Design an enzyme around this catalytic site. Sequence first.
Site, short mmCIF file in Angstrom:
data_model
loop_
_atom_site.label_atom_id
_atom_site.label_comp_id
_atom_site.label_asym_id
_atom_site.label_seq_id
_atom_site.Cartn_x
_atom_site.Cartn_y
_atom_site.Cartn_z
N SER B 39 -59.50 -24.23 15.44
CA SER B 39 -59.30 -25.66 15.66
C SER B 39 -60.11 -26.02 16.87
O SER B 39 -59.62 -26.06 17.99
CB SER B 39 -57.84 -25.96 15.86
OG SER B 39 -57.30 -25.12 16.85
N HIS B 157 -54.14 -22.10 11.66
CA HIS B 157 -54.04 -20.68 11.91
C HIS B 157 -53.22 -19.93 10.88
O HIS B 157 -53.09 -18.70 10.99
CB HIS B 157 -53.40 -20.33 13.26
CG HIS B 157 -54.24 -20.84 14.41
ND1 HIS B 157 -53.75 -20.69 15.67
CD2 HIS B 157 -55.43 -21.40 14.55
CE1 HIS B 157 -54.58 -21.17 16.57
NE2 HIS B 157 -55.64 -21.64 15.89
N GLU B 166 -48.99 -23.99 16.98
CA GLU B 166 -48.44 -22.88 17.70
C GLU B 166 -47.06 -23.18 18.23
O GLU B 166 -46.87 -24.21 18.85
CB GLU B 166 -49.33 -22.48 18.92
CG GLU B 166 -50.78 -22.34 18.57
CD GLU B 166 -51.72 -22.03 19.70
OE1 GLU B 166 -51.17 -21.84 20.82
OE2 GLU B 166 -52.93 -21.97 19.40
N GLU B 209 -52.97 -15.63 14.87
CA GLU B 209 -52.64 -15.23 16.23
C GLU B 209 -51.43 -14.32 16.31
O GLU B 209 -50.89 -14.10 17.39
CB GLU B 209 -52.44 -16.45 17.13
CG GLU B 209 -53.70 -17.22 17.34
CD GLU B 209 -53.69 -18.28 18.38
OE1 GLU B 209 -52.61 -18.54 18.96
OE2 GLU B 209 -54.84 -18.75 18.65
N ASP B 244 -48.38 -25.78 20.79
CA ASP B 244 -49.70 -26.34 20.69
C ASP B 244 -49.72 -27.08 19.36
O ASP B 244 -49.71 -26.45 18.30
CB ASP B 244 -50.81 -25.30 20.70
CG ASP B 244 -52.18 -25.96 20.55
OD1 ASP B 244 -53.15 -25.15 20.58
OD2 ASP B 244 -52.27 -27.20 20.50
N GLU B 292 -49.07 -28.85 24.05
CA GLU B 292 -50.52 -28.94 24.11
C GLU B 292 -51.04 -29.79 22.96
O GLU B 292 -50.52 -29.72 21.85
CB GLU B 292 -51.10 -27.52 24.09
CG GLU B 292 -52.58 -27.40 24.07
CD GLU B 292 -53.03 -26.01 23.68
OE1 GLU B 292 -54.04 -25.84 22.97
OE2 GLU B 292 -52.30 -25.04 24.01
N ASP B 317 -56.24 -29.48 25.71
CA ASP B 317 -57.08 -28.41 25.15
C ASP B 317 -58.31 -29.07 24.55
O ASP B 317 -59.32 -29.18 25.21
CB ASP B 317 -56.26 -27.61 24.14
CG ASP B 317 -57.09 -26.62 23.35
OD1 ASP B 317 -56.65 -26.13 22.30
OD2 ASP B 317 -58.20 -26.35 23.80
N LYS B 342 -60.30 -22.35 28.46
CA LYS B 342 -60.97 -21.57 27.46
C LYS B 342 -62.45 -21.48 27.85
O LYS B 342 -63.19 -22.46 27.74
CB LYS B 342 -60.90 -22.29 26.12
CG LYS B 342 -59.56 -22.09 25.44
CD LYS B 342 -59.44 -22.97 24.20
CE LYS B 342 -58.20 -22.53 23.44
NZ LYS B 342 -57.89 -23.53 22.43
N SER B 369 -56.37 -19.25 28.23
CA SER B 369 -56.12 -19.09 26.80
C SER B 369 -57.18 -18.28 26.09
O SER B 369 -58.34 -18.35 26.43
CB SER B 369 -56.10 -20.48 26.13
OG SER B 369 -55.84 -20.45 24.76
N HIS B 370 -56.67 -17.56 25.11
CA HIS B 370 -57.54 -16.97 24.11
C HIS B 370 -58.09 -18.05 23.18
O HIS B 370 -57.73 -19.22 23.31
CB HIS B 370 -56.67 -15.97 23.34
CG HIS B 370 -55.56 -16.66 22.63
ND1 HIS B 370 -54.80 -15.94 21.79
CD2 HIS B 370 -54.91 -17.85 22.61
CE1 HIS B 370 -53.86 -16.60 21.18
NE2 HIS B 370 -53.88 -17.83 21.73
N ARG B 371 -58.85 -17.61 22.20
CA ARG B 371 -59.10 -18.39 21.01
C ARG B 371 -58.42 -17.69 19.83
O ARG B 371 -58.06 -16.53 19.89
CB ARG B 371 -60.55 -18.52 20.66
CG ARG B 371 -61.40 -19.12 21.79
CD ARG B 371 -60.84 -20.41 22.23
NE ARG B 371 -60.68 -21.52 21.32
CZ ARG B 371 -61.49 -22.55 21.18
NH1 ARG B 371 -62.65 -22.65 21.83
NH2 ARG B 371 -61.19 -23.52 20.35
N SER B 372 -58.30 -18.44 18.75
CA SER B 372 -57.68 -17.80 17.61
C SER B 372 -58.56 -16.72 17.03
O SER B 372 -58.02 -15.84 16.39
CB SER B 372 -57.37 -18.87 16.60
OG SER B 372 -58.47 -19.57 16.17
N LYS B 393 -51.79 -17.98 27.52
CA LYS B 393 -51.39 -17.83 26.12
C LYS B 393 -52.50 -17.00 25.49
O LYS B 393 -53.68 -17.33 25.54
CB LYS B 393 -51.22 -19.13 25.39
CG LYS B 393 -52.43 -19.98 25.20
CD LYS B 393 -52.05 -21.19 24.30
CE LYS B 393 -53.25 -21.63 23.51
NZ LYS B 393 -52.96 -22.74 22.59
F LIG Z 1 -56.09 -25.13 19.60
F LIG Z 2 -55.45 -23.54 21.59
MG LIG Z 3 -57.88 -25.49 18.84
MG LIG Z 4 -55.09 -25.57 21.18
#
Ligand SMILES: [F-]
Ligand SMILES: [F-]
Ligand SMILES: [Mg+2]
Ligand SMILES: [Mg+2]
Lengths: 432, 435
Positions: B39, B157, B166, B209, B244, B292, B317, B342, B369-372, B393
């Site tokens: 996303s 996701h 999320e 995730e 999220d 988020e 985000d 990110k 944050s990570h990414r997916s 996260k």
């Molecule tokens: F996201």
């Molecule tokens: F995210």
């Molecule tokens: Mg996203």
């Molecule tokens: Mg997000």
Amino acid sequence: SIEKIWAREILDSRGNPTVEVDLYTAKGLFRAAVPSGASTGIYEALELRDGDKQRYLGKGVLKAVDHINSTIAPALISSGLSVVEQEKLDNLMLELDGTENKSKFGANAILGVSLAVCKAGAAERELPLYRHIAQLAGNSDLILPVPAFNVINGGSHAGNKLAMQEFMILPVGAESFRDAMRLGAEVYHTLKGVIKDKYGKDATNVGDEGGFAPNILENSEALELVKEAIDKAGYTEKIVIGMDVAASEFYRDGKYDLDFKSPTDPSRYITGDQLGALYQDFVRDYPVVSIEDPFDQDDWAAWSKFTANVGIQIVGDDLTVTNPKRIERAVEEKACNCLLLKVNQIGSVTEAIQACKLAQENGWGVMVSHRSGETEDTFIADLVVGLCTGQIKTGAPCRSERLAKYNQLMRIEEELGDEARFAGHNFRNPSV
Amino acid sequence: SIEKIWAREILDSRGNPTVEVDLYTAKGLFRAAVPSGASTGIYEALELRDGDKQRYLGKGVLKAVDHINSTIAPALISSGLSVVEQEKLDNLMLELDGTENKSKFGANAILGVSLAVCKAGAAERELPLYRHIAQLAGNSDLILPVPAFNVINGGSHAGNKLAMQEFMILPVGAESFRDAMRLGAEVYHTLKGVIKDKYGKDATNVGDEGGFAPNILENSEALELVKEAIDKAGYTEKIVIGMDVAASEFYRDGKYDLDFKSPTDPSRYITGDQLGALYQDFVRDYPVVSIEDPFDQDDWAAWSKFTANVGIQIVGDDLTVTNPKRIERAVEEKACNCLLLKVNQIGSVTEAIQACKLAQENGWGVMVSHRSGETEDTFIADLVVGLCTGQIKTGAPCRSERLAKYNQLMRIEEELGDEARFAGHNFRNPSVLHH
Ligand SMILES: [F-]
Ligand SMILES: [F-]
Ligand SMILES: [Mg+2]
Ligand SMILES: [Mg+2]
Ligand SMILES: [F-]
Ligand SMILES: [F-]
Ligand SMILES: [Mg+2]
Ligand SMILES: [Mg+2]
């Protein structure tokens, strides 16, 4: 010599504790972690868990970690053995534990050290790990394996009715390991669409090893879906199918239950003969070239009969548990013709290499394997290349406890440069 | 200085190509890999993909890799700059790309090198990466963050109807990071059983995730499931919830589609006001302390209105895309009070650090944050500690592209020893915590 060993609890890919070991030498820090199975055969070396039901639901590994930090570490440090002495160090840990099945310290305690020792040994030898392993194993060659990607998960690895555990694709016709990765990924992505179109997006989530977990029961349907994805991706001539049935998971009362994730109903059980007949059907109708654990770990008769009536690869997993003593029986009874090599089934690198050598000496294939509970550790990528086995299963091309290994294999291939050889169609007999 | 740089294509946690960079100095080989979102906000820096439809369904990153190997590498080698000079080296790349959005080389190219430089720089300093980062950021007193574990996955996701992306649990009440891991894992496992009991085993597979992907539509029900798991695991007094929403993914015709994975039907869309009312209910009915992307990345008025009328954390985000320009507007418009950090939304370590600092200077929280689409890279674990943000996260406690980070944070905590301080209830503002 080893300067320091320190173990800790980390989380594996399913969120369960496992052992990680940090080993220091003058060459630096060497870290390894221990995987954990779900469908664990009864003859596997003991995975020691704490059993404190209030803490990580009983699955802590504080005891194992403590055995390393309190007992194994000081013993190995005090021995002054060099980390190149893999067999002496491994044997010392075996003698320290004193039990056949590593139940004093846990195979997970021993293996974590064993793995870190091996990494440290490689550095002491000024070798990449895969070459060190090759030397440990008495191998001059290095070949990149065909990866077997578990793209539909069932059995104990997925929330579905599908009883058989793993449906894998093997890009035997790829040009290289990196190409095999591309073929496996493209088919995997294609398969997501094949599944979504037929079953809807709710069928496109993943099981423990990163393969899709569609809401199906019939194992033949898993094969159909995989075959269709192979075709749709354009790789019918280059990708074949392997399965891990994990039949010990559904053995019941001398029979087998292909709906074991459903409430108990003994009238639905089938005999080993019936199960074999089904496999024969799969082999005839699908490009199935390899079946792992077609029968229970103690159903020797069925393994031997089946192996004698097929030309496909028959892989011992729970049958053999990476254990030379079980492998010897399997060799004698011609129960199977391929060993699944899982270092944590036996508990030490040395014993796993011995198991591999024993299989290979008796004309078997060897497929190096992850467990369904993996970590970010990539040892088995170096292991499969050093052992020259030609085949590795270490997940779908999804979830980085899987990709970590695959990516490492790509890196090893790159490292080997113009000396890189890919097992391809010779995955069962890559010695050639 | 840099002796050699070599980039390659690896696969991310979803099986898509991404960039990995090997950077060599006299201290050795330093390796980093770049994550990838699903996303992805329209204002994110460009993720350069090859678009060769026949190879990796057009998702190769050979072009990025080639930019690194043939153009960025000699440029950095030529510079003779030490790898400790993160900002100088990132700036060289930024100028060489010369585009606002990193569309010449791709943000994925620049970031991969930026990350590897940072690791090499830490080694040159003979510092752990988190300490090098702290120095880069001008921090002294490091903090272990509260982890936010995404234990039910929806949106883009997961294969379910659930529209919101999320549902996270945050062990604010844990004793330490290692303890927060135990709490989160125990709740996650507990949750598997709650889901299985209610919706069956078919509902206990996971999304991108590592969160369960139950076959539900209602976001309230995801919250109910998570609340039930927390309570059944015995941690009601110690674990709170974050979300999220990723609402840009279901922004349609100025309205919001909470069933956007179902065939289009505008009659079901709701307004931003209706959506906000829903969040208000969530915040009242559940222990939700962070939301988020509650609204679309361009629905500024919604954001401001909502943030003004809640006392919880609101995280930009896609709104902010780790981009100081967007952050400056968010600050001015009081659109949110926390930045999701990110690195690959902006494309360099230096810019991400700047973004963090800008947020924090303005009293916002920062959630690393990570990414997916993740990799086995653990950079963001050291990043969150070095930036002292107090919150990260990086997945459910499931899938090792998630656990690798959480495991690294446990190792960092171990390394900090009696100097370890866990953000806990000060996750929004950990600077209050003494050293
Ligand atoms: F996201
Ligand atoms: F995210
Ligand atoms: Mg996203
Ligand atoms: Mg997000
Ligand atoms: F298995
Ligand atoms: F297996
Ligand atoms: Mg098994
Ligand atoms: Mg098996």
